[PDB]
From a paper:
We identified residue 417 as potentially a key difference between the two spikes: in the closed SARS-CoV-2 trimeric spike, Lys417 in the RBD from one spike subunit forms a hydrogen bond with the main chain of Asn370 in the RBD from another spike subunit, stabilizing the RBDs in the closed conformation. In SARS-CoV-1 spike, however, this residue becomes a valine, losing its capability to form the hydrogen bond with another spike subunit and potentially destabilizing the closed conformation of the spike. Thus, we hypothesized that a K417V mutation causes more SARS-CoV-2 spike molecules to take the open conformation. To this end, we introduced the K417V mutation into SARS-CoV-2 spike ectodomain and purified both versions of the protein: K417-spike containing Lys417 and V417-spike containing Val417. To stabilize the recombinant spike ectodomain, we introduced six proline mutations into its S2 subunit to lock up its pre-fusion structure, introduced mutations to its furin motif to prevent it from being cleaved during molecular maturation, and added a C-terminal foldon tag to facilitate its trimerization. For the K417-spike, 55% of the molecules were in the closed conformation with all three RBDs down, whereas the rest of the molecules (45%) were in the open conformation with one RBD up and two RBDs down. In contrast, for the V417-spike, these numbers became 32 and 68% for the closed and open conformations, respectively. Therefore, the K417V mutation allowed more SARS-CoV-2 spike molecules to take the open conformation, confirming our hypothesis. Further 3D refinements using the good particles generated a 3.8 Å map for the closed spike and a 3.9 Å map for the open spike.
Numbering used by the authors:
A (entry chain C): 728 to 835, 848 to 1066
B (entry chain B): 922 to 1146
C (entry chain B): 633 to 676, 689 to 727
Write the structure that this text describes.
Amino acid sequence: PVSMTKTSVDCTMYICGDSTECSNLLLQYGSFCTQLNRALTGIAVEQDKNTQEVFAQVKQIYKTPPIKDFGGFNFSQILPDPSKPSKRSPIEDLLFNKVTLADAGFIKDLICAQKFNGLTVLPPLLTDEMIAQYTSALLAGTITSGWTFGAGPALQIPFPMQMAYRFNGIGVTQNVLYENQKLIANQFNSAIGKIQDSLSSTPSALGKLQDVVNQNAQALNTLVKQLSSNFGAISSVLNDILSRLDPPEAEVQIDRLITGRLQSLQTYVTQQLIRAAEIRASANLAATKMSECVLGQSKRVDFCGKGYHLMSFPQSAPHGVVFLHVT
Amino acid sequence: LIANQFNSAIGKIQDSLSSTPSALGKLQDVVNQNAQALNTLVKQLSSNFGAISSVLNDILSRLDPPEAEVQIDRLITGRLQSLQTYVTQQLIRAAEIRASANLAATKMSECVLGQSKRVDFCGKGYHLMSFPQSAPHGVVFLHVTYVPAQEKNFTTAPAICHDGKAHFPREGVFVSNGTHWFVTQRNFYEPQIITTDNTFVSGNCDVVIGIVNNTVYDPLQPELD
Amino acid sequence: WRVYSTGSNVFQTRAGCLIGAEHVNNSYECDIPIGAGICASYQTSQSIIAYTMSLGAENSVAYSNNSIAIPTNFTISVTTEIL
Ligand SMILES: *[C@@H]1O[C@H](CO)[C@@H](O[C@@H]2O[C@H](CO)[C@@H](O)[C@H](O)[C@H]2NC(C)=O)[C@H](O)[C@H]1NC(C)=O
Ligand SMILES: *[C@@H]1O[C@H](CO)[C@@H](O[C@@H]2O[C@H](CO)[C@@H](O)[C@H](O)[C@H]2NC(C)=O)[C@H](O)[C@H]1NC(C)=O
Ligand SMILES: *[C@@H]1O[C@H](CO)[C@@H](O)[C@H](O)[C@H]1NC(C)=O
């Protein structure tokens, strides 16, 4: 995972929905809602910072040459396809179809009910078509320049010679590769096809992403349920209390409602803060993996997949990243 | 040359920090956040939370304690809940600072006391060394790194056939001006003549894709002949 | 207030719509993030302009199957990092 969905909560619409007397009683509680709004906009900034940290690793956009004479290898499943409006790999299309996202919030469900009570969804800073541009640029740089573009200017180098360098990094003499090129090419292409159909057949692979969305969805959902509890007053609808009692004794009921709703809102925000810290930790892990397993050749055991690491390829997913380790 | 580049680079660090004001924001915001949070706590004393007034000595000097109990209880609830919120937020920020401190300790152990080989862990480029300096509640690393930048192009081949046998570089790569062939290390252009003592032989030259025909000079033969 | 709702430079983005900024055809790096790839800045005779953010310079590397690039000269670099 890299980021979660940015959420903004407006107090005065949530608590005292269109009631001047309710808000005038609310300002006796001081400056709570400024603190709550500040915490939420802090999380909302931090999400954009996380995505910028993971993907904006280089500052130039390379492109692959059109000719595909890569010495027998076949990168047709991770290279971009010009046949679609979304310039993706087919593997990225499998990733975009496996996750059933929610929370559309279109410009005019449960989503509209969430909209009607001060809960808004801010759209992300990076769209779905720039993340693809970074990922395709990293693919282009890796397959045409080795690791030299991770340290300075891009230096072109033929691909099987790069693979000879990468066996020499393991501890194998490079003449192993040049005498067995076709076997390695066939194993690589078969393995890539196995990734494709294995991900296509298994439904339960991407749960690490999905649960995150679900948790946020579930948390937001239970917030709306807290509008329907009366907290010990005679009713839970504020307009009822304003349309039945005089204000000098309706202060008693309204104060109880303010207390209950404010406490529930505080609980929600604390839980979202802790989840934000967790997602930030995983994002720093992802940034370290992108720096080391992709842009270089790590030698730490089991950091870049199981076995002796050769290279990696990144791919994008909605709110996350997917690494292919070649080992 | 390297001495001059190093001294000029250090001077550029000096005047770059001296001219740019917005460098140390990663430190400053931390202090600001704590300052801001603490300031908020003080002005939570001034809200009445639904009572008569926010000054306690007013209520003690206006009411008898059978009703001062009712008013004071509301004040106690409000202030205690605000203080709780402050403590929880400070706990979360403390966990964040501890994570950054463990990152700083890892960088101090690896990028300074040794020579790391992880890419982009100790600055951009191949890492040479580091130097630490202190900062108010923080640390500042100067990474000294090596960046190669003047490229030129050559035409290669994966191996050389000489006598029905393949020859491979013991370390480096075969390059060609267009007429001759040389062995070069992978990060600095320097031609050396293809001999036996920087190559090795393995198999025959009927298998490897793209092997080119040339000759390999023997260091023993003109001494013997 | 109503002194800005007159407009005549109104621009509809994926986040909503923007009033008081003039949409351009260039692509610059981001200054103030608005969202959905749109950023805004204060530049030139001075006003607030909004744009699609620019990811970086486009580049192409001359790949071949028998061509290599090698460096000849080098540079020592010193960078700072604050924690
Ligand atoms: C790389 O592998 C892909 C696998 O998709 C190859 O594409 C297939 O090519 C055959 C040959 O005509 C077609 O019958 C298939 O329909 C293609 N697959 C798809 C999904 O359309 C591609 O040819 C390979 N490229 C190289 C250079 O080997
Ligand atoms: C390798 O790079 C260094 C530094 O870029 C070059 O040294 C420069 O040489 C020119 C000669 O006209 C001087 O004007 C500069 O002052 C030198 N730089 C420094 C920092 O003193 C060196 O010439 C380059 N090597 C080659 C073969 O060109
Ligand atoms: C390199 O590509 C050219 C394409 O014109 C081809 O003729 C040649 O055989 C290739 N050589 C190698 C070693 O792949």
